[PDB]
Amino acid sequence: QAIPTTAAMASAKIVVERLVERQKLENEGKYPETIALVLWGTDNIKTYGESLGQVLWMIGVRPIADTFGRVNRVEPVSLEELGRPRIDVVVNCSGVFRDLFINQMNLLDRAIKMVAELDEPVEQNFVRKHALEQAEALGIDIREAATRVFSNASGSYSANISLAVENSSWNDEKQLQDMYLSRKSFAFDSDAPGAGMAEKKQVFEMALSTAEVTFQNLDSSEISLTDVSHYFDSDPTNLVQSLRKDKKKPSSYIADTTTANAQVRTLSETVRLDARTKLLNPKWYEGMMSSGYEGVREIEKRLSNTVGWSATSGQVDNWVYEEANSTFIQDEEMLNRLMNTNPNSFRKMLQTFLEANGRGYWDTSAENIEKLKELYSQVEDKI
Amino acid sequence: AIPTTAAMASAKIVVERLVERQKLENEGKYPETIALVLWGTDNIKTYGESLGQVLWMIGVRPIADTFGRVNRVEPVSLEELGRPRIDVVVNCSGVFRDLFINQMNLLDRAIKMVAELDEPVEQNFVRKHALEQAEALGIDIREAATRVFSNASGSYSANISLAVENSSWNDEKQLQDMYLSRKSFAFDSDAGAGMAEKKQVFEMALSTAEVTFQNLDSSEISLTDVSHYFDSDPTNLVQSLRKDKKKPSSYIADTTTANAQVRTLSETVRLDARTKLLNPKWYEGMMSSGYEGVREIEKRLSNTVGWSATSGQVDNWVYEEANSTFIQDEEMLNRLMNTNPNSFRKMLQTFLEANGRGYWDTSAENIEKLKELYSQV
Ligand SMILES: [Mg+2]
Ligand SMILES: [Mg+2]
Ligand SMILES: [Mg+2]
Ligand SMILES: [Mg+2]
Ligand SMILES: [Mg+2]
Predict the structure, then answer these.
(1) Which secondary-structure segment (H or E) carries A337?
(2) Is A139 near chain B, with CB under 8 Å?
(3) Which value, in Å, is the radius of gyration of the alpha carbons in chain B?
(4) Under the phi-then-psi rule, with left for phi > 0, alpha for psi from -120 to 50, and beta for the rest, what region is A139?
(5) Distance from A193 to chain B by nearest Cα, in Å?
(6) Secondary structure of chain B in the HEC alphabet?
(7) After which residues is chain B broken (C to N over 2.5 A)?
(8) How far is CA B286 from the centre of its chain?
C-alpha cells in the first residue's frame, strides 16, 4: 500500500534523530551498532507507517512510491545525507503487524538485504558489518545472514510472557526468554516468499546479541506502558542482555508520541512518569477506589503489569514498589478500604508484593514482608 | 588528633554530595548502607577526612578531651542531622589498620552507640539493620552492629590484584571468596583481644549495601595508576551477596578540587581512560621510554581488567578504543613487539582474557587479528 507515507517518514526521521542523539550522548559519542525494536500493527495503521518508517531511517533507506502510488521498493540514502553509519535493526513485528503488513515485511527484508550488500566501509554500515560476521560464522550467504524481520509464527500472538506473569507460573527470567526465542524467531524472507514465516532461531539470537539499544513507540496519553500487558510481553531488553557475551543490558528507550514532537525517553524515565501519573498518583488511585470493586481490580492489574516490566527489563526501580507498599499497605486507611472493597483482588495485590520481593525486584525491610504475610493470612481467613 | 575539626568539616561536604546524588536516583529515599574503603596514607595527609566522612554518615561528632585527644563521640541529634543515619561497611586497608587502631576502636564504639539509640528505624539505618541482624544471627544488637573490618594483623590486600596480575583465577566468585576470607576481620571495642574473624556479620552487612565508595585524588594517583583501588573495591562482592543480585551504585569522590566532586565509578573509569590509556600524550610518551614504557601500557590495561572484574564498570568502548589505538594502528603492534615482546605478549593475553571473561564485546575480526598477532609474537 501507500506506507510509510511522506508524512510518516518526516515524523520518523525526527524520532530516529532524537533516539540516536540521546544514545550517542549517553555513550561517549558512540553510535549504537544495532537497535532491537518492536513494531505494533494497530499503531502503524493509525500513523500510516511511522514506526515502520523509523526502521527505514535507521538503516538509511527511503521508500519510493511507484506509478500507482504503492510503496514497494526503497533506495539507499547516501552516507553523506545520512551523516552517520547505517544502524542495524532487529525488527520484532507483532502478530497483528504480521497479519496486516505482509507487503511491508517484504519491503523491510528486501531493504535490509540490499543495505547489507552495499560496497561500504563496515564502520559506516553496521548492517553489513554484522551480516558479514554472521555469514562467516554460519557459513551462509550475506543476504541470508541479513535476516532481521521477525515475528510470531502464522496464527500465533505474543511471547506468552504476559500470560506467564498473569499466572505467576514461571520460575526464572531464562524461561521467559527461552519462550520469547521459541515463539518470535520466525523470519520473513523476501528471497523466498513461498516459505512463509520460517524459523531462523540461530540468526535471531546472533542479531539480538549485537543489540545495544531497545526501543518501542507508545502514545502514553492513550495507552501507557502499564495500561496493558502487551508492551512488556514483547520487550527484548533482558533477552538481549542474556544473549550478549558481556551480559550488558542494552540501553532501553520509549518514544512517546503524545505531543506533535515525540519525546524519546529512557524506559526507566517512562516507568517513573507513568507511576507518577497512575499507580502512585492520588487522583488516579482514589478515582479507582471511588469505583469500588472494579477499581481495586485495576490497581491490582497495574501492579502486576509493573512486575511484568521488572521481569522483562529490570527498569522498575525499587522506589516504585516501596512507595506502592507505603501507599496501599502501610497506610491503614487505604489498606482497610482495599481489603473491604475487593478481598480477592487485595489478596492478589499481597501476592504481587510478595512475588516482587521473592523474585528480586523489590528490596524492603523484614518487618514490611512480615506485615504482608500477616495480611495474607488475615484476608484468606476473611475469604 | 585525627580526625581534626577541619577534616570533619570537609568530610560533611562530600558526604552530602554523595547521599544527595543517590537520594535523587531513589526519588527521595536515602541509601540505607554505604560500603566504603579507608586508606591509611590518605587519612594521614588529610588529618582524617575520609574517616570523618564515616562519622558524618552515621551522624556522630568526635570529641576532644582536655589533652586534645579525640577519644569518643557524641551523636548529632536526628533533628540537627535532618536525614537518616546511614549504615556503613568500613573496609579499612591494612595500612589504615597499622596506623589507626585507636580510630578503628573509636568508630566501632560510635557505630554500636548509634545502633542502640531510641530512634525511628526509618531515621537510623544502623539500628534498622542491626535489629534484623541480631534476630537472624541470635546475637546481641552491639555484636550485630559490627562494621569496622580489615585484613588480619600483618596482612594486606584481598590478593585480587595478585590474582589479576597472574591471571590465576577461575571466576569472580573466587575473587569474592578471597575478599571475604581475607578482609572479614573485625575490630571489637567491647573486647583488647586483638582481631577476630566475623565473616557472617560481614556478609550480612555487605548484603545491605546499596552504594560503594572510595576517595581518590585523581590528579595525583588515578584509579588505574595502581592496583590497590580495584583490589579493595566491594562493588561486585556486594552484588553477589544480595538476594536480588542488584549491583550497588558505585561512586568515587575525586579530591582534586577544594571540595571533592562525586562521580560514578563508571564516569571515573571513562575520564581516566581518556587521560591515560587512550591519551596520545600518554601512550606515545610511554613508547618513548623504551622497555619500561611498554610495561606501563600493559599494566594500565591489566588494571582496567581488574576494575571490570571487581565492578563491571568499564565500558566496552575503553577496550575497543585501546584496540584501535595499540593494535593495528599498524606500526603499533610491531613497535610493542620490538620494544618489549614479553610485555606485548602479556597485552595480547589481557585483550583475549577481557573478551574470554565477558568484559569486552567486539567483532570476530578484531579477535582473529589479536590471535594472528600473538602467533607472530
Ligand atoms: Mg507507528
Ligand atoms: Mg503479538
Ligand atoms: Mg582521607
Ligand atoms: Mg591493604
Ligand atoms: Mg558522574
Answers:
(1) helix A332-341
(2) no
(3) 22
(4) left
(5) 32
(6) CCCCHHHHHHHHHHHHHHHHHHHHHCCCCCCCEEEEEECHHHHHHHCCHHHHHHHHHHCEEEEECCCCCEEEEEECCHHHHCCCECEEEEEECHHHHHHCHHHHHHHHHHHHHHHCCCCCHHHEHHHHHHHHHHHHHCCCHHHHCCCEEECCCCCCCCCHHHHHHHCCCCCHHHHHHHHHHHCCEECCCCCCCCCEECHHHHHHHHHCCCEEEEEECCCCCCCCCCCHHHHCCCHHHHHHHCCCCCCCEEEEEECCCCCCEEEEHHHHHHHHHHHCCCCHHHHHHHHCCCHHHHHHHHHHHHHHHHHHHHHCCCCHHHHHHHHHHHCCCCHHHHHHHHHCHHHHHHHHHHHHHHHHCCCCCCCHHHHHHHHHHHHHC
(7) 191
(8) 27
Q: Computed from CA positions of residues B361, B364, B368, B373, in that sequence, does the dihedral angle turn out positive or negative?
A: negative
For B337, phi and psi rounded to 5 degrees? -65, -40
Q: CB of B17 within 8 A of CB of B72?
A: no
Distance, in angstroms, between B175 CA and closest chain A CA?
A: 18
β-partners of residue A255 are: A217, A264
Radius of gyration (C-alpha) of chain A in whole angstroms:
22
Interface of B with A in 340-359 (CB under 8 A): 355, 358-359
Peptide bond into A282 cis (omega under 30): no
| 8 Å CB contact of B364 and A129 | no
CB A201 within 8 A of CB A185: yes
- C-alpha B193/C-alpha B115 separation (Å) is 22
Sign for the CA dihedral angle at A264, A267, A268, A270 comes to: positive
Q: Does A323 touch chain B (CB under 8 A)?
A: yes
Q: Phi/psi zone of residue A118: left (φ > 0), alpha (ψ -120 to 50 degrees), beta?
A: beta
Spatial distance between the Cα atoms of A200 and A182, rounded to a whole number of angstroms: 10
The size of chain B, in residues, is 377
Write out the three cell numbers for A325: 507498599
User: Closest Cα of chain B to A246: distance in Å?
Assistant: 4
The structure was resolved experimentally with X-ray
- In sequence order, the β-bridge partners of residue A267 are none
User: Cα(A183)–Cα(A92) distance, rounded to whole angstroms?
Assistant: 11
Cell of B198: 566475623
Contact A269/B at CB under 8 A: no
According to DSSP, residue A250 is labeled P
Residue A71: strand pairing partners: A65
Which amino acid, one-letter code, is at B364? A
Provide long-range contacts, Cβ within 8 A and 24+ apart, for A260-265: A261/A14, A262/A11, A262/A14, A262/A15, A262/A18, A262/A217, A263/A18, A264/A15, A264/A18, A264/A19, A264/A22
Pairing of strands A34-39, B211-216: unpaired
- Is B192 near chain A, with CB under 8 Å? no
* All cell numbers assigned to A177: 526468554
Give me ligand 4 centre to Cα B90, in Å: 13
Interface test with A, best of B125, B240, B244 (most A CBs within 10 A): B244
Q: How far, in Å, is the centroid of ligand 4 from the Cα of B41?
A: 11
Which resolution in angstroms does this entry have? 1.2
Taking contacts as CB-CB distances below 8 angstroms, the residues of chain A near B243 are 360, 363
Other C-beta atoms closer than 10 Å to the C-beta of B36 total 25
Say which amino acid occupies B237: L
